[PDB]
Amino acid sequence: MATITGAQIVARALKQQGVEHMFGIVGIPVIPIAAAAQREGIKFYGFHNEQSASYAAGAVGYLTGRPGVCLAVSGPGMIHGIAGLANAWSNNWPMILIGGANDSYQNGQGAFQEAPQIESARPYVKYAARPDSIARLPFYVEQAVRTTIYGRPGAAYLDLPGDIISGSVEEAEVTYPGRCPEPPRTLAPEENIKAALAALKTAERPLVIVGKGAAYSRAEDEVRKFVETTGLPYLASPMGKGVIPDDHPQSIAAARSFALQNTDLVVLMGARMNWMMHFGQPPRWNEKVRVIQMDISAEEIGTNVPTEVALVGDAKAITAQLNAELEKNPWSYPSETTWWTGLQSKIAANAATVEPMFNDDSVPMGYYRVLRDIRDLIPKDAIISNEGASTMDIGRTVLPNFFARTRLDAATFGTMGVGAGQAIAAASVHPDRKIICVQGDSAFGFGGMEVETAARYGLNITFVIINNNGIGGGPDELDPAHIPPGAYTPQAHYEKMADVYGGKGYFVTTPDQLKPVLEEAMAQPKPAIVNIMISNKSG
Amino acid sequence: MATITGAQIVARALKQQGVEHMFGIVGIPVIPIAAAAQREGIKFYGFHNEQSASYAAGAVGYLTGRPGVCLAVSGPGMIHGIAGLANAWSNNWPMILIGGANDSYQNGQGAFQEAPQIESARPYVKYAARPDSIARLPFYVEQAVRTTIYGRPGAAYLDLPGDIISGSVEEAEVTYPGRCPEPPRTLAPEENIKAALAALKTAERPLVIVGKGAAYSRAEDEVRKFVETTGLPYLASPMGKGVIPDDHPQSIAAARSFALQNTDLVVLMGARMNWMMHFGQPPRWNEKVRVIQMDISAEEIGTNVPTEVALVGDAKAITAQLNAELEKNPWSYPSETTWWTGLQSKIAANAATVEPMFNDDSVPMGYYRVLRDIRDLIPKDAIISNEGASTMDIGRTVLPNFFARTRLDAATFGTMGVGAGQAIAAASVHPDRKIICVQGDSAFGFGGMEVETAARYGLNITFVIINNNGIGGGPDELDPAHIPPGAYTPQAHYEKMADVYGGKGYFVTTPDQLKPVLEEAMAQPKPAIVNIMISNKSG
Amino acid sequence: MATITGAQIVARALKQQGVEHMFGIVGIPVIPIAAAAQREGIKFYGFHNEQSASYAAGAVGYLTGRPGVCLAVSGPGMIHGIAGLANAWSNNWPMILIGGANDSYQNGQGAFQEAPQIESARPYVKYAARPDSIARLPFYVEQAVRTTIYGRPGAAYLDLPGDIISGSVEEAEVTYPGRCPEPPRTLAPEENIKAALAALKTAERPLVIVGKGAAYSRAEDEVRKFVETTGLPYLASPMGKGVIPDDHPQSIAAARSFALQNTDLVVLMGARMNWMMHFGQPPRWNEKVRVIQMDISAEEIGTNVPTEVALVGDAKAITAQLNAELEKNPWSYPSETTWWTGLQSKIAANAATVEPMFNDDSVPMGYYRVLRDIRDLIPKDAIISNEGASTMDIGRTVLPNFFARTRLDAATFGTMGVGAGQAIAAASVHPDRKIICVQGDSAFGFGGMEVETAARYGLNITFVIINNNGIGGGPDELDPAHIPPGAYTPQAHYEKMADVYGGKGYFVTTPDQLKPVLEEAMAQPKPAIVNIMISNKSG
Numbered sequence A, B, C: 001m002a003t004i005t006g007a008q009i010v011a012r013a014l015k016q017q018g019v020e021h022m023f024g025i026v027g028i029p030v031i032p033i034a035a036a037a038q039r040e041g042i043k044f045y046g047f048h049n050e051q052s053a054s055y056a057a058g059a060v061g062y063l064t065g066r067p068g069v070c071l072a073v074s075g076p077g078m079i080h081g082i083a084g085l086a087n088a089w090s091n092n093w094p095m096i097l098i099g100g101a102n103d104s105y106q107n108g109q110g111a112f113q114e115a116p117q118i119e120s121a122r123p124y125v126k127y128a129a130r131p132d133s134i135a136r137l138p139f140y141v142e143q144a145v146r147t148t149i150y151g152r153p154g155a156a157y158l159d160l161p162g163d164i165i166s167g168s169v170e171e172a173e174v175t176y177p178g179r180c181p182e183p184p185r186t187l188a189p190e191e192n193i194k195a196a197l198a199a200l201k202t203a204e205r206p207l208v209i210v211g212k213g214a215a216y217s218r219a220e221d222e223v224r225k226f227v228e229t230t231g232l233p234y235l236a237s238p239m240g241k242g243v244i245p246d247d248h249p250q251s252i253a254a255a256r257s258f259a260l261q262n263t264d265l266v267v268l269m270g271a272r273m274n275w276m277m278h279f280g281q282p283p284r285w286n287e288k289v290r291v292i293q294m295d296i297s298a299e300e301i302g303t304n305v306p307t308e309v310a311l312v313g314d315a316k317a318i319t320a321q322l323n324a325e326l327e328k329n330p331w332s333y334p335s336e337t338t339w340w341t342g343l344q345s346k347i348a349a350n351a352a353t354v355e356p357m358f359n360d361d362s363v364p365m366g367y368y369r370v371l372r373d374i375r376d377l378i379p380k381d382a383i384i385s386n387e388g389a390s391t392m393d394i395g396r397t398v399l400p401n402f403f404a405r406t407r408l409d410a411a412t413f414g415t416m417g418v419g420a421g422q423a424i425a426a427a428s429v430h431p432d433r434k435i436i437c438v439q440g441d442s443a444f445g446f447g448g449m450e451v452e453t454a455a456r457y458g459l460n461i462t463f464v465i466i467n468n469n470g471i472g473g474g475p476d477e478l479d480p481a482h483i484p485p486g487a488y489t490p491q492a493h494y495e496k497m498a499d500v501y502g503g504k505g506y507f508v509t510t511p512d513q514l515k516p517v518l519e520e521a522m523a524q525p526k527p528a529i530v531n532i533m534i535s536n537k538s539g
């Protein structure tokens, strides 16, 4: 009778549960898993460090609604992968770390790479399991996948001893669960839907905030209809950008600080009152601000600031409830108020502030001058990976998104080291699209070796480094006796790393080079690296 | 009156406790800690990834007997550094990870990089503390330091909320403990000393195993005297190499398998019966092997295999006891026995096997041909960082050490990613010496960016890459449809990364290039990278 | 061929490793373990609550130097037993908690009493393991036992899934390790021994502190010799009482506060500078006290106060080193010093203060009057379980111990709930001796049901209750509208609980009852309960 190994069972089960992308580094005892994954049609990418690979797995979860898988060897391989668990935990992204473990009959002997891996994953996962036996592996795979995507999404860890992977059972002894179905999109009570709309009608300065929860829910159509029907001003969080196109006339992103400080009623659509929103507290918010909060996690309701109307459930379903109730009882915010006037004035004052910076041609160059030529060459449906400090914060302001889930950045954990991994994930999920990775020089160095990974798999990524010689800048000449802790080699020629795989690297210092270099670099058949020097005083 | 910040208190206490080397990446909230560490005379190295920096910290502990410090930001910074905690835990090396945390008065709010950092470090540390107040910081620093180096050495984690770092107290409020003394060197009972020597006199095929615990104990003088007085055959573990010079006539390294399989009594001097020694069990050991075990950890005694004589205490002190008892009652193993004859015959047969490989000039080249020329140009007091699979395992055989603590490799955890970090740690500890980094191509990619860190600090490191196109080898041409999980870009020109910082990169394919290229590379004032292609069949 | 279950294997291995006492409560799946333990000759005691049972296991470890075993069912049974693990952790006593677990093939299903038991035990154990297979069970038992008694003693947890317990293997597949030997008694370097005695000679006001680590080391004969040879004053910690007989002329126990405040050099013999010693800090100690510290734990050296001479190793062996060096170089503290004269003055005042209270016959009675008659009737070799607040702290003062390891109290963790369990442990280890349990009324209530356990097994235990109607005293009359949080029913007749098992209960309120009742109760063939009312203003 026919037999099958644990590795093959895991690969077949993962494929059945909708897993399509796997990132990691092979080695004892997970070599057969990557091989069986390739034969099952799962796309496997061999990275240079599991850290970057584990970040890629979480980004796949955000982009597709099914967990990406990070495959790691026992011990230090799994521990490197904890970075991606924690990032997925922080952003509530579906993600599975699969870590090898030493053979179970060697526990307690000081086996090769013996480590407490379950306990190391526990703080950051919704689910951690070591399968008891080979025949029950599909049980744990299905339960892990379902746990990552049902409820508030998050991370799972599977601990596979080497003898579970390499052992075999009779195929007739293995039961496979059906593919985990899409999670149920739960709805708010009818009274909360009505109380939320009634509350909006009493507000003098209302504001909608569209966060990456709305983007993960795939709610862009419902959100856009809700914002347009109500005529409400809206603000997109960094990764909420593009749920509504960033050029929409009701966006007040250029008046963000004014809007947050003066709004009296905010509608949080899949966004938390966490550090990114200044906890919804003074001085950045008004002391008496009223909150309508839409979130799949009931425990998030009322964090930091009380919530007047709680809308617990799926953002797509709940926003459809609001649009349906607005169909029965139409209402819109007026086009001319003192609120719109003040918002429109601040937007105009901001345009006056940034225009001299956008057209500043002095050398060394500023952020705005460089991001202007980058922005004007990105395809409209390209996916942008944007990572750094000022590179990423100004990048958020200058680089628009016109579709949902097309910006990947440092997100809630503020992580450096996600840039190349998230770009590789985006390229894997969207093979037909252009991927633009825009990183600060420090951010680039966290996962720089993965440019070769992008070349090896033929990924349509272009790497742009905005280089000010360090973390928020570094001197033009290093004094060997006093190297600042956050400085790097002045004018480090990172673009030379393209020569590792036969790609093209460009070194840019003057504004006249920007457009012809960025154009020729984006048309390259291999990933190009564009290294753009900027002033260490720019900001 | 005069005041002082938490960051300055921590830097001063660390310096008082004998900390000399700090590796990490700055950012909120640890920016002032690196600044104050430099003002106290602590050498701070800004890395490209905290993963590599945390590995450097553990290597410093091994090399110096005082913990190296890894400095990481809150959240993902600290989580990246968990790699170093686990490596230090695996090797019992003294090491401190200092992790920033969010301001304490923002706990529970979703603060920037809020994370359960103590619980993340817990599985791998002997000590984890969040200092309760600024004034007590020196209490925690001394307790952390003392705990890493007393008893079985291990890792510590210090959790520093931003307001503990940035807040101030009056200088007269702070008490600084004295410098933590050297740990007391404990002795074995005198009857155990006599029983051990008595047991040795009954053995027909005795063997000494010199492990890195003897190296860490700084026991080289007593261990060499003990082996020479007794005339016993000895086997050095990978990082035990050099405790006795590797050209010593009593080394049976080239007959290792024969020695372990047939010995009837082994003396473990700071070495574990773990996976490296195949658990001391059949078939690689004899079923009835008798064990004299010398370890500072009483709990380690009798793991896997029963121990006949337990010598619990410090290796230097216990070996001095053995030498003093041999001085009162002399004894030595006879220089002509059938045991010696078999060992000598196996060593000679091994020399006949490897001589053709050492002199094989065929292209693409093999490991032995390449390592032969590396070996002959390495200074005798150089420090070797050797990392990979066959690159490291063959490197252990071919590259000799003549002094203790001059080899750093993947060690007990089998970690890829330590190579450059441990090389940088070695250069920091021994600035007067040449550091040779010999890695496989895959190993090099785990932290290849750190070659720029080596250049930025002017470290005397030469990076040698032994490149077979992947993990255990990769094909000469990649099939875009079928990319092997462990392959990299064929003939990837990693030496081009030397151009990032203005160094010299060399690409070697034939034996005639080896000697002049390695000679010119080692004499470079900046770190050179030598990329050496070998066959993917070799190993 | 002959087969054997996992339960029978575990019972056989525990017996081979020196385990002689098992306490717990049976149920799925540990029922076969208790039965097999009885057939092996292990004494099994069925308690009424795993909490009390787990406290008995730790006490067995302290008394015998081999771990007592607590046997608990899966889930809440094991969780109840964590109390004992934490107490053993706090006191560094060897103990094993053996917890059942649900069948491994039901993991993830919501099985009966499925719970994360290893992670629940982790913070308090030196060792936690789920055996991977039935045939390797003896490996884990020996490793667990060895880990509890080697090094600094502590607790271990064995997680046993029901299918490991109930399954069977062929006896020829099971290898049993040899009995774990007594750990080696490690020595301090000879220069530290000389340094300690040399520092002793420079002291103006030297003091010896004898802790329960010296008692656990079985070092009483060496400690008594050292103290008598040097003529030094000594203080016995609560459970260090009896190491030297409490009526020894050199005891300064009655001048404890004066001695700690004025000593300029203390010899700590198995005793910590923890909360019990007020951290060795002012105002209770002198700011400049010098410390000679003798402890098996290197990490304990130098906690809170610097240590001038560290003596790391076994108390018995190291004290014998001190006595041997005092034989080569005799020294003794002079008579007629102001130190001894000041101490004897303080001792005489204390004796004069308490003698009125010893003879005060007023009703309600006081602590000293009651404990005077208890003291005058306890056999010299009896074992005293003394628990509560004032009942225990004054009991420490009034009830002397003449042999080592004859006082069990709340110890380092200050735990209520240990009294009856530790009395049952003591009766199990020393069946030939009288056990006296002297508890406060609140302390008695924690484990009161276990008086039936003592009667069921014919244990020679007398239960004395000192009753002041609550935690540190409650009112004479309870108003139902305002019941104090720490008060109990006034004059609660706990002695009526002897009638549950057909024993004798006594209720005592006047001094003329004390002697007749106590004499009658101690001669009972079943455990008697003496409920002694005392004033709530006493103490």
Ligand SMILES: Nc1ncnc2c1ncn2[C@@H]1O[C@H](COP(=O)(O)OP(=O)(O)O)[C@@H](O)[C@H]1O
Pocket: A091, A092, A152, A153, A210, A211, A212, A213, A214, A216, A217, A237, A238, A239, A240, A270, A271, A272, A273, A274, A276, A294, A295, A296, A297, A300, A313, A314, A315, A316, A411, A412
């Ligand atoms: N399907 C869904 N429907 C509604 N809310 C969701 C859904 N999935 C996740 N969320 C919530 O969206 C929120 C996203 O918040 P956050 O990550 O802070 O967004 P941003 O960073 O864009 O402000 C999380 O609190 C999460 O619980």
Ligand SMILES: Nc1ncnc2c1ncn2[C@@H]1O[C@H](COP(=O)(O)OP(=O)(O)O)[C@@H](O)[C@H]1O
Pocket: B091, B092, B152, B153, B210, B211, B212, B213, B214, B216, B217, B237, B238, B239, B240, B270, B271, B272, B273, B274, B276, B294, B295, B296, B297, B300, B313, B314, B315, B316, B412
């Ligand atoms: N000062 C010391 N004296 C004696 N033994 C020590 C000392 N420090 C550490 N050790 C022990 O040395 C052992 C080294 O074992 P291991 O790392 O397996 O060596 P190797 O890998 O070289 O065989 C550890 O068990 C550790 O407890």
Ligand SMILES: Nc1ncnc2c1ncn2[C@@H]1O[C@H](COP(=O)(O)OP(=O)(O)O)[C@@H](O)[C@H]1O
Pocket: C091, C092, C152, C153, C210, C211, C212, C213, C214, C216, C217, C237, C238, C239, C240, C270, C271, C272, C273, C274, C276, C294, C295, C296, C297, C300, C313, C314, C315, C316, C411, C412
């Ligand atoms: N065999 C031994 N020899 C010496 N010290 C020991 C031994 N076993 C345990 N100890 C130590 O004895 C100390 C007991 O301290 P503690 O419990 O505070 O005593 P006490 O409460 O009586 O003051 C612990 O620090 C422990 O490490």
Ligand SMILES: Cc1ncc(C[n+]2csc(CCOP(=O)(O)OP(=O)(O)O)c2C)c(N)n1
Pocket: A387, A388, A389, A390, A391, A392, A414, A415, A416, A417, A439, A440, A441, A442, A443, A444, A466, A468, A470, A471, A472, A473, B025, B026, B027, B028, B073, B076, B077, B080
């Ligand atoms: C894992 C991790 N380590 C460190 C940090 C701290 N940090 C925040 S931004 C940054 C780099 C900023 O420099 P760069 O990417 O060059 O951007 P710039 O601001 O100079 O444009 C670092 C190290 C972090 N957020 N995450």
Ligand SMILES: Cc1ncc(C[n+]2csc(CCOP(=O)(O)OP(=O)(O)O)c2C)c(N)n1
Pocket: A025, A026, A027, A028, A073, A076, A077, A080, B387, B388, B389, B390, B391, B392, B414, B415, B416, B417, B439, B440, B441, B442, B443, B444, B466, B468, B470, B471, B472, B473
């Ligand atoms: C953190 C970590 N990830 C993965 C592995 C698995 N592993 C062991 S050796 C190795 C690299 C082997 O390739 P290379 O360095 O080129 O050496 P070669 O054997 O080809 O000479 C890898 C990835 C590991 N040990 N540690």
Ligand SMILES: Cc1ncc(C[n+]2csc(CCOP(=O)(O)OP(=O)(O)O)c2C)c(N)n1
Pocket: C387, C388, C389, C390, C391, C392, C414, C415, C416, C417, C439, C440, C441, C442, C443, C444, C466, C468, C470, C471, C472, C473
């Ligand atoms: C597990 C636990 N719960 C609670 C306490 C708090 N506590 C300390 S002493 C004590 C009892 C005091 O009353 P009693 O035993 O009657 O003694 P008395 O002082 O009245 O003589 C209690 C509950 C504790 N130490 N441990």
Ligand SMILES: [Cl-]
Pocket: A089, A090, A091, A092
């Ligand atoms: Cl979260």
Ligand SMILES: [Cl-]
Pocket: B430, B432, B433
């Ligand atoms: Cl040197």
Ligand SMILES: [Cl-]
Pocket: C089, C090, C091, C092
């Ligand atoms: Cl403790």
Ligand SMILES: [Cl-]
Pocket: C236, C237, C238, C276
């Ligand atoms: Cl005391």
Ligand SMILES: [Mg+2]
Pocket: A440, A441, A442, A466, A467, A468, A469, A470, A471, A472, A473
């Ligand atoms: Mg920068």
Ligand SMILES: [Mg+2]
Pocket: B440, B441, B442, B466, B467, B468, B469, B470, B471, B472, B473
């Ligand atoms: Mg290779």
Ligand SMILES: [Mg+2]
Pocket: C440, C441, C442, C466, C467, C468, C469, C470, C471, C472, C473
């Ligand atoms: Mg009471």
